[PDB]
């Protein structure tokens, strides 16, 4: 399938959709890491994720997705699924393992808390949102069970951040891709959407505020909301 004429890969291209309250919780993740590391990148606002050309990039037909030049320039590489976009950026650009982890010990914990989000909170939150808003029929027993599972996940994150000196989910000293992956689903605005009082997880709330005060995180949230609302609506932004 032929790509749009304005889609060229001279650097990392992050594929997003038009910014809304419900369209940015996955796409913000790679953008945060790009902002943290100062990686050169373009933004491509996808009008239709069902477009055949886009399914050749991401067969799951969702944002975020990435096209980038391989380090030696011989291939065009792709990343899709938000956790995979974080892994790719860390692999290609986080030379020092500042967010990816510097040694086997660091990476063992990072991958525990990253995968916990990827396998448990992420999909539980997505299934809650699907059955709450998108499913033609309302299934209240299923929705209540998923909401219950979210409280159990918040309990695990709270327990972790109550451990001595544990300022971040994976490492004590600094945020990692585990923290970036978790933040959008573990912050006050998301908790209130789920019908939960975030104050009931005080160390988790403190952690979300600490993450939120980072300049890269602030820039990421601002830009993801703005995409498609500038001079250009769809395609490669300038």
Contact set with a copy of itself (CB under 8 A):
59-60, 70-71, 75, 77-84, 87-88, 91-92, 103-105, 107-109, 111-112, 114-116, 118-120, 122-124, 127, 131, 135, 137, 139, 141-142, 145, 156, 159-160
Paired sense of beta strands 41-45 and 12-16, if any = parallel
- Nearest Cα residue to 7 out of 62, 51, 39: 51
Q: How far is the CB of 119 from a copy of itself (least distance, A)?
A: 5
Q: How far is the CB of 209 from a copy of itself (least distance, A)?
A: 22
Comparison of 117 and 223: residue with beta carbon closer to a copy of itself: 117
Comparison of 162 and 222: residue with beta carbon closer to a copy of itself: 162
Q: How far is the CB of 201 from a copy of itself (least distance, A)?
A: 14
Comparison of 132 and 228: residue with beta carbon closer to a copy of itself: 132
Q: How far is the CB of 1 from a copy of itself (least distance, A)?
A: 13
For the chain, count helices (H), then strands (E).
Answer: 10, 5
Q: How far is the CB of 137 from a copy of itself (least distance, A)?
A: 7
Comparison of 139 and 209: residue with beta carbon closer to a copy of itself: 139
Comparison of 38 and 136: residue with beta carbon closer to a copy of itself: 136
Cβ pair 85, 66 in contact under 8 A: yes
Q: How far is the CB of 176 from a copy of itself (least distance, A)?
A: 13
Comparison of 71 and 212: residue with beta carbon closer to a copy of itself: 71
Helical residues (DSSP H) of 80-214, grouped into ranges: 82-93, 104-116, 122-129, 140-161, 177-182, 188-193, 202-212
Sign of CA dihedral 58, 63, 64, 70: positive
- Nearest Cα residue to 196 out of 185, 207, 212, 211: 185
CA-CA distance, 107 to 100, in Å (whole number)? 7
Which residues, 6+ apart, have CB-to-CB distance to 213 below 8 Å? none
Backbone angles phi, psi at 87, to 5 degrees: -60, -45
Sign of CA dihedral 191, 61, 9, 98: positive
């Amino acid at each position: 399938s032929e790509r749009p004429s304005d889609l060229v890969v001279n650097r990392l291209v992050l594929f997003v959709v038009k910014g809304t309250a419900t369209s940015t919780h996955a796409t913000v993740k790679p953008l945060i890491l790009l902002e943290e590391l100062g990686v050169p990148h373009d933004i491509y606002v996808v009008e239709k994720v069902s477009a055949p050309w886009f399914s050749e990039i991401n067969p799951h037909k969702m944002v975020p997705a990435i096209l980038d030049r391989s380090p030696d320039g011989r291939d065009t590489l792709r990343a899709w699924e938000s956790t995979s976009t974080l892994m790719y950026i860390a692999d290609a650009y986080d030379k020092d393992g500042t967010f990816g982890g510097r040694n086997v010990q660091e990476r063992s914990e990072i991958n525990n808390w990253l995968t916990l989000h990827t396998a448990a909170l992420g999909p539980t939150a997505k299934y809650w949102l699907y059955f709450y808003k998108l499913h033609p029929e309302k299934l209240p027993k299923t929705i209540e069970k998923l909401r219950s599972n979210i409280t159990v996940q918040y309990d695990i994150l709270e327990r972790r951040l109550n451990e001595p000196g544990q300022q971040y989910l994976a490492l004590k000293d600094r945020p990692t891709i585990a923290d970036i992956a978790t933040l959008p689903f573990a912050m006050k605005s998301t908790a209130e959407l789920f019908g939960l009082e975030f104050e009931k997880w005080p160390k988790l709330q403190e952690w979300s505020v600490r993450m939120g005060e980072r300049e890269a995180v602030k820039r990421a949230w601002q830009r993801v909301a703005g995409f498609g609302h500038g001079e250009k609506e769809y395609g490669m932004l300038e």
